[PDB]
Design a protein around this ligand. Structure first.
Ligand SMILES: CS(=O)c1ccc(-c2nc(-c3ccc(F)cc3)c(-c3ccncc3)[nH]2)cc1
Length: 334
């Protein structure tokens, strides 16, 4: 569509979707790759997201997470307008797949395992993805799953998690935990487990489980299935406005998982219940999730790696992005 000069090395560009994603042919490694164009330097926020993702993806090394094979940009800061990230092609994603394909229990089980195996590495690095959803889970022709889109990712900060009632949030609404609309900034690992739970539910019926039309409607959806929170769960919500809103709602009963998904594996529904738990403190953790009987055919903690090393003006951020992408320049490559 517009300028996408990825150099002589990458040819045969086919469009896909702070820029554009395209497929290309790697004339060196002889494989078909995916390249993403990012033009973020005009804004501080866009630069912060870009630097953040580049830093995270370059440090991370995992089969279930998109790795950066190459980065294309100009030789100087002055000439650098766009940055191109390159990785192995994954022809599809869960969103596209769930629109037309019904998943067998075996596929749901394999997909969930890969999501959690990847999430285990992300969390061991003290990082939170914060925006897990079907469009972020890429798949190739052999069913390998990789997590991408670390733009809203942050370092975990449980001690600074609390905020007020109705505090605006950045991530995709349908996959937001209930505590986000109540008293959480999303700085805890339990935020990702909820999203994964929503994804599982979506894989079981090919439909989003909590499709809120706006901020508060999202909570209405969650409480519609989980029912009214227990007194114990309400006691953990010290924020008055949040607790009082919950208390003002008429009693809602829990909708049984086996009633919502009558053709699902019982063990899958047991794990779904543990991931979609209202109370973030009682919510299952990624390693407990992996150890659940539903994934026993795949569980092998010794083959579920953890991270070796855990984790400003637009001008200085542009400078940092330049310095962060310097290792891929033709200089040392030659
Ligand atoms: C939630 S969303 O709209 C969203 C935006 C971009 C992407 C998305 N970004 C990439 C992509 C490409 C190169 C990179 F190095 C990094 C990411 C891909 C990609 C990677 C591998 N094979 C095919 C496509 N898809 C995925 C989800």
């Amino acid at each position: 569509g517009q300028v996408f000069d990825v150099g002589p090395r990458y040819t045969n560009l086919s469009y896909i979707g702070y820029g554009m994603v395209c497929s290309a042919y790697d004339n060196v490694n002889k494989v078909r790759v995916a390249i993403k164009k990012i033009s973020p330097f005009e804004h501080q926020t866009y630069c912060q997201r870009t630097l953040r993702e580049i830093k995270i993806l370059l440090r991370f090394r995992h089969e279930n997470i998109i790795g950066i094979n190459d980065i294309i940009r100009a030789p100087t800061i002055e000439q650098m307008k766009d940055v191109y990230l390159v990785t192995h092609l994954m022809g599809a994603d869960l969103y596209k797949l769930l629109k037309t394909q019904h998943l067998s229990n075996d596929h749901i089980c394999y997909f969930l395992y890969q999501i959690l195996r990847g999430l285990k590495y992300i969390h061991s690095a003290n990082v939170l993805h914060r925006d897990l959803k079907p469009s972020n889970l890429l798949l190739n022709t052999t069913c390998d799953l990789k997590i991408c889109d670390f733009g809203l990712a942050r370092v975990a900060d449980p001690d600074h998690d609390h905020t007020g009632f109705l505090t605006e949030y950045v991530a995709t609404r349908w996959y937001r935990a209930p505590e986000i609309m109540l008293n959480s900034k999303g700085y805890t690992k339990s935020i990702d487990i909820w999203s994964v739970g929503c994804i599982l539910a979506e894989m079981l019926s090919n439909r989003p489980i909590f499709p809120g039309k706006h901020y508060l409607d999202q909570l209405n959806h969650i409480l519609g299935i989980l029912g009214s929170p227990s007194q114990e769960d309400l006691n953990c919500i010290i924020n008055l406005k949040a607790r009082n809103y919950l208390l003002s709602l008429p009693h809602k009963n829990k909708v049984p998982w086996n009633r919502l998904f009558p053709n699902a594996d019982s063990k899958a529904l047991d794990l779904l219940d543990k991931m979609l738990t209202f109370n973030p403190h009682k919510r299952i953790e990624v390693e407990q999730a992996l150890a659940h009987p539903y994934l026993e055919q795949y569980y092998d903690p010794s083959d579920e790696p953890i991270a070796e090393a855990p984790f400003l003006p637009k001008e200085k951020l542009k400078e940092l992005i330049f310095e962060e992408t310097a290792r891929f320049q033709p200089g040392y490559r030659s």
